[PDB]
Amino acid sequence: AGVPFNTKYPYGPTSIADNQSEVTAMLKAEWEDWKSKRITSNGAGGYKRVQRDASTNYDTVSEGMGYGLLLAVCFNEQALFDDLYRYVKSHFNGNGLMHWHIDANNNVTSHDGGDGAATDADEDIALALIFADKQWGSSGAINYGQEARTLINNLYNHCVEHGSYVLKPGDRWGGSSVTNPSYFAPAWYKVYAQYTGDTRWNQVADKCYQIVEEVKKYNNGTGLVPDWCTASGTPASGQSYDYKYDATRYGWRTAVDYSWFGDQRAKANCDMLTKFFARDGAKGIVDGYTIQGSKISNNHNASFIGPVAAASMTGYDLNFAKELYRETVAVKDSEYYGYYGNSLRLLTLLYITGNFPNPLSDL
């Protein structure tokens, strides 16, 4: 079970790794490294949690739990998965969604609405539970399927704007006036629809593509999306409208929709994004651009490489894709800031090596 999955994506390439035989050993080593640095029982209330790095004093954000659960199930670590999930369950708010911010002492933060939920985190946690149900079954200590069905319902009821199907960034704010393209996970929603029978999720997926279609009027054909925007693709008041640390995840979530479902809107969007980055090459990728393409920051790090390699999966240029795979493996952030970028690096590596199959397919 788990890595290596030995499965083939129904659309596009299954892997862009140059040496398929060494990939498995590499993934396992990177996972062991991630595990030792990120997983801790300190401040976990008797379970385990994914901690951020020294830069934020080893706190925990729900986003980290989503990443950790997806990685734990893909690497077939059931005992770890269960302990991480018990921590999540001990942090479900009044709406049945996870507190987004908790300190290293297990206290929810009050200055930043830490008790509210962040949509991208819970959607990742829900997908991880589906993988768990499919891989291991739900007759053990935790009934993954039931937990998944419950979380998906809460996600729809509190994180989707009724009537418009616009994805909200949290359970208590946003929607048409402010949403986050990097949270758009059409492949996840299609899986939710098929897994639960709730077809409303397909509408949410379509609405995500319609919003990005609006963004295309302002990005000058670069394929770049803003960190935040309204449902009209315009700037959200007081929120970044540039392609920075949030937006970088868009290429990864979108590419998966092409690999799993062959969605042509996904290919069109990812090919555009890949073509933009092809101008400067794999080494030229920096950590900040306006959506029209101007460089606004100049650091080359792990938060921005892997997502572009993921986007290259849709087939703009398979030679450039190999260079991007090589760069993704090569660039690993220092430990002081080792949480975010290194987590995205490992998730994208699973995907681009053919190790992130649709959990509803034949595993």
mmCIF file of C-alpha atoms in Angstrom:
data_model
loop_
_atom_site.group_PDB
_atom_site.id
_atom_site.type_symbol
_atom_site.label_atom_id
_atom_site.label_comp_id
_atom_site.label_asym_id
_atom_site.label_seq_id
_atom_site.Cartn_x
_atom_site.Cartn_y
_atom_site.Cartn_z
ATOM 1 C CA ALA A 1 0.000 0.000 0.000
ATOM 2 C CA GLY A 2 1.151 3.544 -0.748
ATOM 3 C CA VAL A 3 4.440 4.666 -2.256
ATOM 4 C CA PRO A 4 5.253 3.308 -4.703
ATOM 5 C CA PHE A 5 1.696 3.165 -6.006
ATOM 6 C CA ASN A 6 2.784 1.690 -9.382
ATOM 7 C CA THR A 7 -0.382 3.142 -10.922
ATOM 8 C CA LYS A 8 -0.759 5.211 -14.125
ATOM 9 C CA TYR A 9 -2.656 8.505 -14.410
ATOM 10 C CA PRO A 10 -5.360 8.183 -17.075
ATOM 11 C CA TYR A 11 -4.299 11.434 -18.795
ATOM 12 C CA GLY A 12 -0.916 12.997 -19.478
ATOM 13 C CA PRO A 13 2.420 11.568 -18.292
ATOM 14 C CA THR A 14 2.523 9.398 -15.153
ATOM 15 C CA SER A 15 5.960 10.568 -14.202
ATOM 16 C CA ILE A 16 8.402 13.274 -15.304
ATOM 17 C CA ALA A 17 11.211 11.859 -13.137
ATOM 18 C CA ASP A 18 14.305 11.189 -15.186
ATOM 19 C CA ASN A 19 15.206 8.010 -13.241
ATOM 20 C CA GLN A 20 12.155 6.051 -12.153
ATOM 21 C CA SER A 21 14.161 3.318 -10.423
ATOM 22 C CA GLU A 22 15.712 5.694 -7.793
ATOM 23 C CA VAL A 23 12.573 7.734 -7.146
ATOM 24 C CA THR A 24 11.136 5.445 -4.468
ATOM 25 C CA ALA A 25 14.306 5.483 -2.361
ATOM 26 C CA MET A 26 14.474 9.249 -2.683
ATOM 27 C CA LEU A 27 10.820 9.778 -1.653
ATOM 28 C CA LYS A 28 11.184 7.550 1.387
ATOM 29 C CA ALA A 29 14.325 9.401 2.535
ATOM 30 C CA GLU A 30 12.635 12.778 2.107
ATOM 31 C CA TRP A 31 9.607 11.537 4.050
ATOM 32 C CA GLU A 32 11.787 10.295 6.944
ATOM 33 C CA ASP A 33 13.428 13.714 7.033
ATOM 34 C CA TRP A 34 10.085 15.563 6.963
ATOM 35 C CA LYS A 35 8.686 13.288 9.697
ATOM 36 C CA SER A 36 11.550 13.840 12.129
ATOM 37 C CA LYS A 37 11.482 17.627 11.773
ATOM 38 C CA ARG A 38 7.725 18.298 11.528
ATOM 39 C CA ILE A 39 5.932 15.745 13.700
ATOM 40 C CA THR A 40 5.830 16.240 17.439
ATOM 41 C CA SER A 41 3.890 15.108 20.488
ATOM 42 C CA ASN A 42 4.906 18.274 22.407
ATOM 43 C CA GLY A 43 1.809 20.452 22.761
ATOM 44 C CA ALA A 44 -0.344 17.805 21.032
ATOM 45 C CA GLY A 45 -2.636 16.955 23.995
ATOM 46 C CA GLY A 46 -1.734 13.272 24.018
ATOM 47 C CA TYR A 47 -1.621 12.845 20.219
ATOM 48 C CA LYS A 48 0.682 14.195 17.533
ATOM 49 C CA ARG A 49 0.711 17.401 15.487
ATOM 50 C CA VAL A 50 2.516 18.907 12.522
ATOM 51 C CA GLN A 51 4.517 21.870 13.794
ATOM 52 C CA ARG A 52 5.692 24.805 11.746
ATOM 53 C CA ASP A 53 9.307 25.961 11.992
ATOM 54 C CA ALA A 54 11.433 28.144 14.222
ATOM 55 C CA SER A 55 10.344 31.301 12.399
ATOM 56 C CA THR A 56 6.856 31.008 13.894
ATOM 57 C CA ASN A 57 7.854 29.335 17.155
ATOM 58 C CA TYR A 58 6.742 25.794 16.222
ATOM 59 C CA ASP A 59 3.047 26.610 16.246
ATOM 60 C CA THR A 60 0.470 24.635 14.236
ATOM 61 C CA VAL A 61 -1.867 25.746 11.443
ATOM 62 C CA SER A 62 -4.655 23.535 10.071
ATOM 63 C CA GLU A 63 -2.973 23.721 6.634
ATOM 64 C CA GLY A 64 -0.047 21.770 8.124
ATOM 65 C CA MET A 65 -2.400 19.068 9.385
ATOM 66 C CA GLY A 66 -3.892 18.697 5.888
ATOM 67 C CA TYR A 67 -0.403 18.298 4.368
ATOM 68 C CA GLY A 68 0.689 15.863 7.083
ATOM 69 C CA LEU A 69 -2.401 13.647 6.724
ATOM 70 C CA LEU A 70 -2.031 13.469 2.931
ATOM 71 C CA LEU A 71 1.669 12.527 3.310
ATOM 72 C CA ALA A 72 1.031 9.971 6.105
ATOM 73 C CA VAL A 73 -1.582 8.062 4.112
ATOM 74 C CA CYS A 74 0.493 8.110 0.883
ATOM 75 C CA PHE A 75 3.454 6.683 2.809
ATOM 76 C CA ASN A 76 1.253 4.056 4.486
ATOM 77 C CA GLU A 77 1.755 5.236 8.059
ATOM 78 C CA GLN A 78 -1.551 4.347 9.635
ATOM 79 C CA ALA A 79 -0.559 4.776 13.320
ATOM 80 C CA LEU A 80 0.881 8.233 12.615
ATOM 81 C CA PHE A 81 -2.197 9.168 10.546
ATOM 82 C CA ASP A 82 -4.532 8.215 13.400
ATOM 83 C CA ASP A 83 -2.629 10.274 15.950
ATOM 84 C CA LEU A 84 -2.512 13.325 13.684
ATOM 85 C CA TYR A 85 -6.274 12.983 13.041
ATOM 86 C CA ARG A 86 -7.028 12.733 16.796
ATOM 87 C CA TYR A 87 -5.314 16.135 17.151
ATOM 88 C CA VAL A 88 -7.511 17.548 14.313
ATOM 89 C CA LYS A 89 -10.645 16.086 15.924
ATOM 90 C CA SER A 90 -9.647 17.680 19.237
ATOM 91 C CA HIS A 91 -9.657 20.994 17.317
ATOM 92 C CA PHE A 92 -12.998 20.940 15.451
ATOM 93 C CA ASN A 93 -14.818 24.229 15.978
ATOM 94 C CA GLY A 94 -18.568 24.835 16.339
ATOM 95 C CA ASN A 95 -19.062 24.228 12.606
ATOM 96 C CA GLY A 96 -17.150 20.947 12.623
ATOM 97 C CA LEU A 97 -14.129 22.458 10.874
ATOM 98 C CA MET A 98 -10.580 22.738 12.277
ATOM 99 C CA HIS A 99 -9.302 25.719 14.294
ATOM 100 C CA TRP A 100 -6.847 27.247 11.814
ATOM 101 C CA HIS A 101 -4.220 28.484 14.302
ATOM 102 C CA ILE A 102 -2.968 26.933 17.564
ATOM 103 C CA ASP A 103 0.205 27.779 19.523
ATOM 104 C CA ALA A 104 2.920 25.326 20.590
ATOM 105 C CA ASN A 105 1.149 25.026 23.976
ATOM 106 C CA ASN A 106 -2.121 23.806 22.396
ATOM 107 C CA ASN A 107 -4.029 27.059 22.929
ATOM 108 C CA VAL A 108 -6.049 28.399 19.991
ATOM 109 C CA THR A 109 -4.790 31.876 19.050
ATOM 110 C CA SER A 110 -7.195 34.762 19.843
ATOM 111 C CA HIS A 111 -5.652 37.801 18.125
ATOM 112 C CA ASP A 112 -6.166 36.381 14.636
ATOM 113 C CA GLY A 113 -9.434 34.460 14.887
ATOM 114 C CA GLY A 114 -7.553 31.186 15.332
ATOM 115 C CA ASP A 115 -10.803 29.380 16.133
ATOM 116 C CA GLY A 116 -12.222 29.992 12.642
ATOM 117 C CA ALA A 117 -11.484 27.500 9.865
ATOM 118 C CA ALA A 118 -9.354 27.927 6.694
ATOM 119 C CA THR A 119 -10.986 26.160 3.718
ATOM 120 C CA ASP A 120 -7.862 24.757 2.020
ATOM 121 C CA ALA A 121 -6.821 22.917 5.198
ATOM 122 C CA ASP A 122 -10.165 21.160 5.718
ATOM 123 C CA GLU A 123 -10.517 20.204 2.061
ATOM 124 C CA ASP A 124 -7.070 18.521 2.237
ATOM 125 C CA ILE A 125 -8.001 16.763 5.505
ATOM 126 C CA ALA A 126 -11.246 15.507 3.875
ATOM 127 C CA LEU A 127 -9.345 14.151 0.848
ATOM 128 C CA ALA A 128 -6.795 12.427 3.183
ATOM 129 C CA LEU A 129 -9.691 10.667 5.004
ATOM 130 C CA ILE A 130 -10.998 9.356 1.645
ATOM 131 C CA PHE A 131 -7.509 7.952 0.857
ATOM 132 C CA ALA A 132 -7.447 6.377 4.348
ATOM 133 C CA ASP A 133 -10.852 4.734 3.820
ATOM 134 C CA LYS A 134 -9.745 3.342 0.460
ATOM 135 C CA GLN A 135 -6.322 2.134 1.436
ATOM 136 C CA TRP A 136 -6.886 0.804 4.925
ATOM 137 C CA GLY A 137 -10.629 0.513 5.365
ATOM 138 C CA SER A 138 -12.801 2.048 8.118
ATOM 139 C CA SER A 139 -13.429 -0.859 10.431
ATOM 140 C CA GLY A 140 -10.528 -0.077 12.774
ATOM 141 C CA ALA A 141 -10.093 2.566 15.475
ATOM 142 C CA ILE A 142 -11.215 5.440 13.276
ATOM 143 C CA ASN A 143 -14.076 5.173 10.815
ATOM 144 C CA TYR A 144 -12.405 7.237 8.051
ATOM 145 C CA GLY A 145 -15.410 7.100 5.741
ATOM 146 C CA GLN A 146 -17.834 8.430 8.316
ATOM 147 C CA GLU A 147 -15.392 11.164 9.386
ATOM 148 C CA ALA A 148 -14.932 12.087 5.705
ATOM 149 C CA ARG A 149 -18.649 12.253 4.994
ATOM 150 C CA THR A 150 -19.210 14.435 8.038
ATOM 151 C CA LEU A 151 -16.357 16.854 7.192
ATOM 152 C CA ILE A 152 -17.399 17.141 3.523
ATOM 153 C CA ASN A 153 -20.917 18.091 4.595
ATOM 154 C CA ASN A 154 -19.637 20.741 6.985
ATOM 155 C CA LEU A 155 -17.334 22.040 4.217
ATOM 156 C CA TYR A 156 -20.230 22.435 1.830
ATOM 157 C CA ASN A 157 -22.595 23.965 4.368
ATOM 158 C CA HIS A 158 -20.115 26.528 5.764
ATOM 159 C CA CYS A 159 -17.412 27.057 3.131
ATOM 160 C CA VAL A 160 -19.473 27.343 -0.032
ATOM 161 C CA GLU A 161 -21.528 30.420 -0.854
ATOM 162 C CA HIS A 162 -25.086 29.251 -1.454
ATOM 163 C CA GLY A 163 -26.647 30.224 -4.771
ATOM 164 C CA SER A 164 -23.367 31.175 -6.485
ATOM 165 C CA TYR A 165 -21.252 28.106 -5.501
ATOM 166 C CA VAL A 166 -18.283 30.433 -4.875
ATOM 167 C CA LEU A 167 -15.721 28.856 -2.519
ATOM 168 C CA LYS A 168 -15.336 30.847 0.747
ATOM 169 C CA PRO A 169 -11.839 31.221 2.272
ATOM 170 C CA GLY A 170 -13.178 30.437 5.746
ATOM 171 C CA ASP A 171 -16.307 29.242 7.479
ATOM 172 C CA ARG A 172 -17.041 32.750 8.730
ATOM 173 C CA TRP A 173 -16.124 35.242 6.004
ATOM 174 C CA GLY A 174 -15.549 35.886 2.353
ATOM 175 C CA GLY A 175 -17.067 34.425 -0.756
ATOM 176 C CA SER A 176 -17.963 36.670 -3.720
ATOM 177 C CA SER A 177 -16.192 39.726 -2.194
ATOM 178 C CA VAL A 178 -13.004 37.781 -1.385
ATOM 179 C CA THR A 179 -11.808 34.276 -2.203
ATOM 180 C CA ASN A 180 -8.409 32.573 -2.722
ATOM 181 C CA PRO A 181 -7.633 30.863 -6.104
ATOM 182 C CA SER A 182 -4.923 28.677 -4.459
ATOM 183 C CA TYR A 183 -7.732 27.008 -2.453
ATOM 184 C CA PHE A 184 -9.568 25.959 -5.647
ATOM 185 C CA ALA A 185 -9.396 22.161 -5.793
ATOM 186 C CA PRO A 186 -11.669 20.990 -8.660
ATOM 187 C CA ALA A 187 -10.214 17.404 -8.614
ATOM 188 C CA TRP A 188 -10.986 17.152 -4.873
ATOM 189 C CA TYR A 189 -14.598 18.334 -5.437
ATOM 190 C CA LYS A 190 -15.195 15.830 -8.224
ATOM 191 C CA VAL A 191 -13.977 13.070 -5.876
ATOM 192 C CA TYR A 192 -16.282 14.418 -3.124
ATOM 193 C CA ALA A 193 -19.219 14.312 -5.570
ATOM 194 C CA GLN A 194 -18.530 10.704 -6.562
ATOM 195 C CA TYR A 195 -17.676 9.569 -3.044
ATOM 196 C CA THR A 196 -20.744 11.011 -1.299
ATOM 197 C CA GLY A 197 -23.308 11.179 -4.119
ATOM 198 C CA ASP A 198 -23.623 14.983 -3.578
ATOM 199 C CA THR A 199 -23.453 16.419 -7.076
ATOM 200 C CA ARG A 200 -23.488 20.017 -5.853
ATOM 201 C CA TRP A 201 -19.677 19.693 -5.584
ATOM 202 C CA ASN A 202 -19.426 19.547 -9.408
ATOM 203 C CA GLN A 203 -20.966 23.047 -9.533
ATOM 204 C CA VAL A 204 -18.323 24.311 -7.113
ATOM 205 C CA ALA A 205 -15.593 22.901 -9.427
ATOM 206 C CA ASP A 206 -17.149 24.650 -12.457
ATOM 207 C CA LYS A 207 -17.436 27.917 -10.537
ATOM 208 C CA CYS A 208 -13.705 27.813 -9.675
ATOM 209 C CA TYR A 209 -12.810 27.664 -13.392
ATOM 210 C CA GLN A 210 -15.255 30.476 -14.177
ATOM 211 C CA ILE A 211 -13.547 32.743 -11.594
ATOM 212 C CA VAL A 212 -10.076 32.020 -13.029
ATOM 213 C CA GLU A 213 -11.515 32.719 -16.506
ATOM 214 C CA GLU A 214 -12.323 36.243 -15.192
ATOM 215 C CA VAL A 215 -8.763 36.581 -13.854
ATOM 216 C CA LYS A 216 -7.534 35.941 -17.435
ATOM 217 C CA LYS A 217 -8.784 39.391 -18.430
ATOM 218 C CA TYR A 218 -6.170 40.928 -16.142
ATOM 219 C CA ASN A 219 -3.139 38.640 -16.189
ATOM 220 C CA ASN A 220 -1.982 39.417 -19.694
ATOM 221 C CA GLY A 221 -1.919 35.785 -20.837
ATOM 222 C CA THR A 222 0.663 34.716 -18.263
ATOM 223 C CA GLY A 223 -1.609 32.173 -16.570
ATOM 224 C CA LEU A 224 -0.662 33.679 -13.181
ATOM 225 C CA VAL A 225 -3.351 33.984 -10.508
ATOM 226 C CA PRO A 226 -3.501 36.422 -7.556
ATOM 227 C CA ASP A 227 -3.192 35.382 -3.885
ATOM 228 C CA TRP A 228 -6.682 36.841 -3.368
ATOM 229 C CA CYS A 229 -9.471 38.242 -5.555
ATOM 230 C CA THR A 230 -13.256 38.729 -5.808
ATOM 231 C CA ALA A 231 -15.461 36.333 -7.784
ATOM 232 C CA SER A 232 -15.038 38.865 -10.660
ATOM 233 C CA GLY A 233 -11.286 38.299 -10.698
ATOM 234 C CA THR A 234 -10.584 41.799 -9.387
ATOM 235 C CA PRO A 235 -8.594 42.883 -6.270
ATOM 236 C CA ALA A 236 -9.993 42.093 -2.849
ATOM 237 C CA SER A 237 -9.670 45.134 -0.512
ATOM 238 C CA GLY A 238 -6.580 44.963 1.646
ATOM 239 C CA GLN A 239 -5.471 41.559 0.262
ATOM 240 C CA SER A 240 -2.570 40.756 -2.026
ATOM 241 C CA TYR A 241 -3.487 40.684 -5.685
ATOM 242 C CA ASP A 242 -0.001 39.412 -6.615
ATOM 243 C CA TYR A 243 1.247 35.871 -7.316
ATOM 244 C CA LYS A 244 3.069 35.098 -4.059
ATOM 245 C CA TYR A 245 3.129 32.469 -1.332
ATOM 246 C CA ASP A 246 -0.580 31.594 -1.500
ATOM 247 C CA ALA A 247 -1.013 31.624 -5.320
ATOM 248 C CA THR A 248 1.978 29.332 -5.916
ATOM 249 C CA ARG A 249 -0.205 26.335 -4.961
ATOM 250 C CA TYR A 250 -2.623 26.931 -7.861
ATOM 251 C CA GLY A 251 -0.563 25.017 -10.449
ATOM 252 C CA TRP A 252 -0.394 21.914 -8.248
ATOM 253 C CA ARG A 253 -4.122 21.705 -7.429
ATOM 254 C CA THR A 254 -5.103 22.460 -11.041
ATOM 255 C CA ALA A 255 -2.707 20.008 -12.712
ATOM 256 C CA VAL A 256 -4.126 17.104 -10.667
ATOM 257 C CA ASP A 257 -7.559 17.768 -12.266
ATOM 258 C CA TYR A 258 -6.004 17.125 -15.681
ATOM 259 C CA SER A 259 -4.140 13.935 -14.561
ATOM 260 C CA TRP A 260 -7.095 12.385 -12.795
ATOM 261 C CA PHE A 261 -10.024 13.623 -14.897
ATOM 262 C CA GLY A 262 -8.547 14.944 -18.116
ATOM 263 C CA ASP A 263 -10.249 18.317 -17.647
ATOM 264 C CA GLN A 264 -9.323 20.537 -20.645
ATOM 265 C CA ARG A 265 -9.768 23.761 -18.634
ATOM 266 C CA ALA A 266 -7.002 22.442 -16.311
ATOM 267 C CA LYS A 267 -4.662 21.751 -19.248
ATOM 268 C CA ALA A 268 -5.343 25.190 -20.813
ATOM 269 C CA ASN A 269 -4.569 26.939 -17.501
ATOM 270 C CA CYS A 270 -1.483 24.899 -16.626
ATOM 271 C CA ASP A 271 0.009 25.129 -20.140
ATOM 272 C CA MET A 272 -0.265 28.932 -19.893
ATOM 273 C CA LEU A 273 1.431 29.041 -16.511
ATOM 274 C CA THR A 274 4.177 26.649 -17.640
ATOM 275 C CA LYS A 275 4.825 28.662 -20.791
ATOM 276 C CA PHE A 276 5.279 31.830 -18.686
ATOM 277 C CA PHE A 277 7.945 30.201 -16.489
ATOM 278 C CA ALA A 278 9.630 28.728 -19.573
ATOM 279 C CA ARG A 279 10.860 32.264 -20.420
ATOM 280 C CA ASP A 280 13.482 32.361 -17.641
ATOM 281 C CA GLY A 281 13.808 28.617 -17.104
ATOM 282 C CA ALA A 282 13.863 26.447 -13.983
ATOM 283 C CA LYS A 283 16.722 28.348 -12.335
ATOM 284 C CA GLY A 284 15.001 31.701 -12.927
ATOM 285 C CA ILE A 285 11.918 30.999 -10.831
ATOM 286 C CA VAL A 286 11.536 33.638 -8.050
ATOM 287 C CA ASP A 287 9.140 34.078 -5.134
ATOM 288 C CA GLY A 288 6.870 36.921 -6.230
ATOM 289 C CA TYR A 289 5.339 38.310 -9.450
ATOM 290 C CA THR A 290 2.502 40.675 -10.337
ATOM 291 C CA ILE A 291 -0.140 38.775 -12.259
ATOM 292 C CA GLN A 292 0.923 40.584 -15.427
ATOM 293 C CA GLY A 293 4.384 39.009 -14.947
ATOM 294 C CA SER A 294 6.688 41.537 -13.293
ATOM 295 C CA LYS A 295 9.162 40.125 -10.766
ATOM 296 C CA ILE A 296 8.604 41.687 -7.356
ATOM 297 C CA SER A 297 10.824 39.437 -5.248
ATOM 298 C CA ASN A 298 13.989 37.592 -6.188
ATOM 299 C CA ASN A 299 14.473 34.503 -3.968
ATOM 300 C CA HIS A 300 14.665 31.027 -5.570
ATOM 301 C CA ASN A 301 13.143 28.592 -3.067
ATOM 302 C CA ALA A 302 11.048 25.431 -2.557
ATOM 303 C CA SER A 303 7.676 27.244 -2.250
ATOM 304 C CA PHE A 304 7.735 28.084 -5.982
ATOM 305 C CA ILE A 305 9.494 25.305 -7.902
ATOM 306 C CA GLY A 306 7.477 22.125 -7.247
ATOM 307 C CA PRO A 307 4.086 23.722 -8.132
ATOM 308 C CA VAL A 308 5.493 24.779 -11.550
ATOM 309 C CA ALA A 309 6.828 21.239 -12.097
ATOM 310 C CA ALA A 310 3.292 20.006 -11.254
ATOM 311 C CA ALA A 311 1.818 22.423 -13.795
ATOM 312 C CA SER A 312 4.287 21.144 -16.435
ATOM 313 C CA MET A 313 2.569 17.733 -16.242
ATOM 314 C CA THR A 314 -0.188 18.926 -18.585
ATOM 315 C CA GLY A 315 2.290 18.767 -21.538
ATOM 316 C CA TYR A 316 3.382 22.278 -22.715
ATOM 317 C CA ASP A 317 6.989 21.025 -23.050
ATOM 318 C CA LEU A 318 8.103 17.650 -21.666
ATOM 319 C CA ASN A 319 11.760 18.587 -21.906
ATOM 320 C CA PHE A 320 11.174 21.631 -19.653
ATOM 321 C CA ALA A 321 9.177 19.336 -17.359
ATOM 322 C CA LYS A 322 12.308 17.161 -16.763
ATOM 323 C CA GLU A 323 14.351 20.247 -15.931
ATOM 324 C CA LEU A 324 11.647 21.300 -13.486
ATOM 325 C CA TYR A 325 11.655 17.832 -11.856
ATOM 326 C CA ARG A 326 15.454 18.119 -11.391
ATOM 327 C CA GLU A 327 15.169 21.613 -9.887
ATOM 328 C CA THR A 328 12.400 20.487 -7.481
ATOM 329 C CA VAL A 329 14.641 17.744 -6.078
ATOM 330 C CA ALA A 330 17.656 20.093 -5.973
ATOM 331 C CA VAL A 331 16.114 23.002 -4.048
ATOM 332 C CA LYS A 332 15.348 22.369 -0.372
ATOM 333 C CA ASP A 333 14.941 25.242 2.100
ATOM 334 C CA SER A 334 16.990 25.802 5.219
ATOM 335 C CA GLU A 335 15.555 24.517 8.474
ATOM 336 C CA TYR A 336 14.790 27.873 10.092
ATOM 337 C CA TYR A 337 12.157 28.308 7.340
ATOM 338 C CA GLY A 338 11.802 24.613 6.639
ATOM 339 C CA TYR A 339 8.038 24.198 7.041
ATOM 340 C CA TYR A 340 6.171 25.650 4.100
ATOM 341 C CA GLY A 341 8.338 25.225 1.035
ATOM 342 C CA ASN A 342 9.658 21.812 2.020
ATOM 343 C CA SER A 343 6.091 20.581 2.608
ATOM 344 C CA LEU A 344 4.978 21.762 -0.866
ATOM 345 C CA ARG A 345 8.141 20.188 -2.335
ATOM 346 C CA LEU A 346 7.272 16.755 -0.953
ATOM 347 C CA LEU A 347 3.584 16.933 -1.971
ATOM 348 C CA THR A 348 4.439 17.969 -5.532
ATOM 349 C CA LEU A 349 7.178 15.291 -5.737
ATOM 350 C CA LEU A 350 4.556 12.625 -4.911
ATOM 351 C CA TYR A 351 2.406 13.938 -7.736
ATOM 352 C CA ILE A 352 5.042 14.390 -10.451
ATOM 353 C CA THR A 353 6.580 10.938 -9.875
ATOM 354 C CA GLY A 354 3.188 9.201 -10.337
ATOM 355 C CA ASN A 355 2.548 8.717 -6.631
ATOM 356 C CA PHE A 356 -0.671 10.695 -6.069
ATOM 357 C CA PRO A 357 -3.416 8.695 -7.826
ATOM 358 C CA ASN A 358 -7.150 9.376 -7.648
ATOM 359 C CA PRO A 359 -8.187 7.610 -4.378
ATOM 360 C CA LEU A 360 -11.330 6.295 -6.157
ATOM 361 C CA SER A 361 -9.360 4.589 -8.924
ATOM 362 C CA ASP A 362 -7.767 1.093 -8.792
ATOM 363 C CA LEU A 363 -4.859 1.563 -6.324
#
